[PDB]
Amino acid sequence: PKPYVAINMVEVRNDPKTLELFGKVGPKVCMVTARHPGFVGFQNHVQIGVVPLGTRWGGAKMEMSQEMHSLMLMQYTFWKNWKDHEEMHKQNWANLFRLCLQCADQMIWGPYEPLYEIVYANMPLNTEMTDFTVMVGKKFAAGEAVSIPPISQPYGKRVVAFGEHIVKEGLENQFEEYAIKTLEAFRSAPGFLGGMILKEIGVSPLGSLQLNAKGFHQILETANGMDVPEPVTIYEAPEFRNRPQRYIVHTEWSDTNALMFGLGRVLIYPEVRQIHDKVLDTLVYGPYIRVLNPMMEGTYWREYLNEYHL
Amino acid sequence: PKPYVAINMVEVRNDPKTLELFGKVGPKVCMVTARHPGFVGFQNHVQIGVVPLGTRWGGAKMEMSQEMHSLMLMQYTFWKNWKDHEEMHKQNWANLFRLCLQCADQMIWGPYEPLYEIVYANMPLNTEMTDFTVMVGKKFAAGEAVSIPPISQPYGKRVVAFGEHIVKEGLENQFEEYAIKTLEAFRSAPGFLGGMILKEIGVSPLGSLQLNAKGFHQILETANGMDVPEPVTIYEAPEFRNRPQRYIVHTEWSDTNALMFGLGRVLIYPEVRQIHDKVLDTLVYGPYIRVLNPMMEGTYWREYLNEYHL
Amino acid sequence: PKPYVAINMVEVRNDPKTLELFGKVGPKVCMVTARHPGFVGFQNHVQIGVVPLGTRWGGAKMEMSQEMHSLMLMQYTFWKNWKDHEEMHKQNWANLFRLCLQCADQMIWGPYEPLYEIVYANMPLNTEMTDFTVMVGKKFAAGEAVSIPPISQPYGKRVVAFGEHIVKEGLENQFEEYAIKTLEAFRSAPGFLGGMILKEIGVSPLGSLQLNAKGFHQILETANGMDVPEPVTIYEAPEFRNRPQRYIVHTEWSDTNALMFGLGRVLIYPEVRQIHDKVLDTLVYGPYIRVLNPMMEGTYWREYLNEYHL
Amino acid sequence: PKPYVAINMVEVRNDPKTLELFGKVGPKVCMVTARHPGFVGFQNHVQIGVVPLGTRWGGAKMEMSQEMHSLMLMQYTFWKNWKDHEEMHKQNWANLFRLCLQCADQMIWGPYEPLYEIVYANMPLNTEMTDFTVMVGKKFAAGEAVSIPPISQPYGKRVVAFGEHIVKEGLENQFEEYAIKTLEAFRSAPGFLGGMILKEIGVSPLGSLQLNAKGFHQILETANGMDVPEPVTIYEAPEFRNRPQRYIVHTEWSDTNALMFGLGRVLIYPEVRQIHDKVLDTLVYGPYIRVLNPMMEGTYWREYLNEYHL
Ligand SMILES: [Fe+3]
Ligand SMILES: [Fe+3]
Ligand SMILES: [Fe+3]
Ligand SMILES: [Fe+3]
């Protein structure tokens, strides 16, 4: 089935101390999150750049991570229902608060965790280059050679285009129809590894460290998280649902050149350009496309999505 | 059929003199070992690191071999019966003792050679990236497309997870049932190249240089092995069988990232986590996972195991 | 009386960060351990080398600690009964787990805590070079000039030979008889400071961080130990008793030269060589002798052993 | 059909001037040689090392070309009949002599051109890594999936083992039977790209610059080849046929590691070792195995050999 996505967004310092926190805190958060049975996987990203679109953002590059002082992280977690994510944060609040405060001396902005519903998904199983013989052998034996997916390599060997779209009130049905048609047109592009369309349905309060006045002061006052705040919030997740409607267009590409000319088909390929013009006529903001590197992954979330493994 | 494994374990210095002994003594030992008809192959490893499991062993890294003063070597030899290995060491004792003493000025600990029985094996044929066209062509012509194995590249192009498990008395049947189910669950992980479960059944006395009192003094007294000790031991191999039962969980991965997130499924994937919880409830020691690099290989041992070549 | 010994074995990184943990965590562990009345003292060691025995381990030296990337630590604790050690770990589990996890980012292997019974002991009171006038004055006034011990200087001013022996089933009575006679023969060697023979009787589960499946996951998931695992183990200490029988032959020497030629009397002194030949005829593994430096000590454990102080 | 091979052997200096002669003279020689219709292709090699076989030639390495002062070149030309090669050299003698004398200030030994008959051949079509989709698609459409060859990459992306064997008089039938069985056993080795067995049938006089006394003096006297010697020789090619019989065992491997452990199966794999023991019992000289790099190739000679292209 289609899972629900929580996207944890943080800005951290770009220094060697922070990349130690990728391997010493990141796995522990995933292990605490995996105590809940509704957890079906994760995909963690570091922003490496921005699609400039010619000179529209000409100060930005697709690979600019070596020059930035701060790193944007997008940590996806996938859930059977979005209430499973809110139940996970409440039941594991002491362990998760203490782990998140280990990243405190690196954190610049955040955490901010909007919740998303998957509107459309074409996301294949992640395979290494050593695994494609198993993949095409199983699909040929099942008579499904026409549905053999591309080789989507896990753990930092592909790039993600993170496309932010804010759609005018009343034009959400027109966005979703033609953004789907745009992503089906990307299937012809070389290096396209798959795509999904995410629709924001709320913001997690506990994942965003948004408590009431007593809880907010206990966050500021605690020594390394030993003094755990009482996890009382003033809102639940659908009460912070941003209007007008936010959409993420998430597409995966084998490299940044395939991303630049593949996504560029909405500008340079005239048949795809008329399709994406209907998307552009619904937007109050966007498109702004961040380039992400999926470092740490829980690739079995695509096994839940595609209802098939290996 | 399933062969028996002798695992020769030595600690040697990490210096350029030692890596000359890989190419000037290592092949000679394999050639003396191949005088016996029960010898079916070998697989030689160098430990390159330890799986840290978050911060459980936080001073350890998966790739730490450039910083270590000493190298752990695990030299597997594969045998039609474990008595063939003990017969080989007795019949070729003078040549093997002299070759092992060429590594003497580098050796820090060892040699220690426990003998193992293969409980479970899913170990495919080793193929290069130039050989997969032959592999999928032969399996399609035989109507076995569903059993096409992953590309397991020989000679240092993959990594080995060496998982040490000591199982409580009486819980060996529960370990073997659910460690098998854990290794079948690894088939879904990207970059999984195969696995086997080894059960310790004894320790070779001649392979461990364990003689009686007269033989031990002749080992210390000899000049470069020219004075060969009489190979009289005080025990045979099943008389040194460690209780409680030692198990090796040997899994092969395309790279260390595939190893870290693949083996990590027993911590972060909730369906595999319940399976491996039954493994953890049988352990008096472990799991401790070393990361090994298979440098020198006798890959035809998998032809004996899978009863098929090419 | 003869106390029981728990030997905590860890491998840590050899870096200046680790030697800060000797003085900032080590004393706190000893202070938590001293809450129990059955605690009678401690002796903490760092491995500085290996006895090479000619060229048997020729890559090893007696003083090689300046070149090693990792340090082996042997932390002895002495107990009136071995159940007092298991009762101490359960009652002080939260404080001890949190202190042990301060060493986590340095730890490579371990912790592993086998429990030992003292078979034989000739271990004198530790005296400084300023204290021998008190020692010989008290022994002359008591008419015990014939039992005046050697000056065994505490706190890093002597070396320890850590002799590992694994004895065949049924030959444990022959080992203990002639290993005692070997240690009485060491009394004639210059620089011999005393010796004891330790017999492994079990492995502490809490001291080895060996919990059940829920406890093991809480060890991996916790942030610096603030989230304390429930200390439920699947075994008690005599249920992990290694067969065949492990022995430690622990001897103390004034320097490494006295150690090398003193222990070498089992090879070069013909009267002691026939005695130790009966020890060698019982061994399935060994002898392997590590060289240890006793840095931090609780020297009053010898006051309990010898039933006399000063 | 099976072509005939002329192998031009020269020793040249290892300097940057010589590698200019690879690209400025080498192609011109191939273009003059292609004037004859019996020319079916070429394969030019540079020796990069020697198989040491443990310490049998321990001063030699498989990759030692960066340290050598001189380069051995083996330039294969393939012919429909060996008389076509002798007819080519006589008809194009002025152009070929002038091109060969452009390499004169680099040449140390040679040229020496023995002629060979192909006894056995398993030499697939050369394909790039971009061409395997065409190769497996054509073989599946023709119902020949069982005979899909390995990917043999042209132009320096594989290595050649050049195995010299001199066989006793009367044992040539025993050599050819079991050297064929050895090369069929190499089909199981990883990275084996194919093999052929060459039998020396003569030495080309014009290709070896072996003229009569007047022609030899005109070779020494000429200014850059403008003064062309009269190509009168004292012998034809079967009159210089070396006795006892020379054989080349030519095998191709994806890399030097695949070569070392693949060819090593005649020493370490006991089933192949008994086969190659019958080869060794026919040899008065050898085996001596040079490691060659096939830089410049005329890969369409395998299209003539396998009677099929693409
Ligand atoms: Fe969350
Ligand atoms: Fe062995
Ligand atoms: Fe303890
Ligand atoms: Fe020629």
Residue numbers in the entry:
A (entry chain J), B (entry chain A), C (entry chain K), D (entry chain V): 2 to 311
Please give me the paper's original passages concerning this structure.
Sulfur oxygenase reductases (SORs) are present in thermophilic and mesophilic archaea and bacteria, and catalyze oxygen-dependent oxygenation and disproportionation of elemental sulfur. Each monomer has an 8-stranded β barrel core surrounded by 10 α helices.
The cryo-EM structure was determined at 2.24 Å resolution using an instrument operating at 200 kV. The reconstructed cryo-EM structure consisted of 24 identical polypeptides with residues from Pro2 to Leu311. The CheckMyMetal server indicated trigonal bipyramidal 5-coordination with an outlier nVECSUM of 0.26 and the distances between the iron atom and the ligands were slightly greater than those in the crystal structure. The cryo-EM maps around Cys31 and Cys104 exhibited different features compared with the crystal structure, while Cys101 was also observed as a non-flexible free thiol. The map around Cys31 is extended with a branch. The lengths of the extensions toward the iron and Cys104 are ~4.0 Å and ~3.4 Å, respectively at a 0.0435 (4.5σ) contour level. These lengths correspond to approximately two disulfide bonds (2.05 Å for each), thus implying formation of a persulfide, trisulfide, or branched oligosulfides.
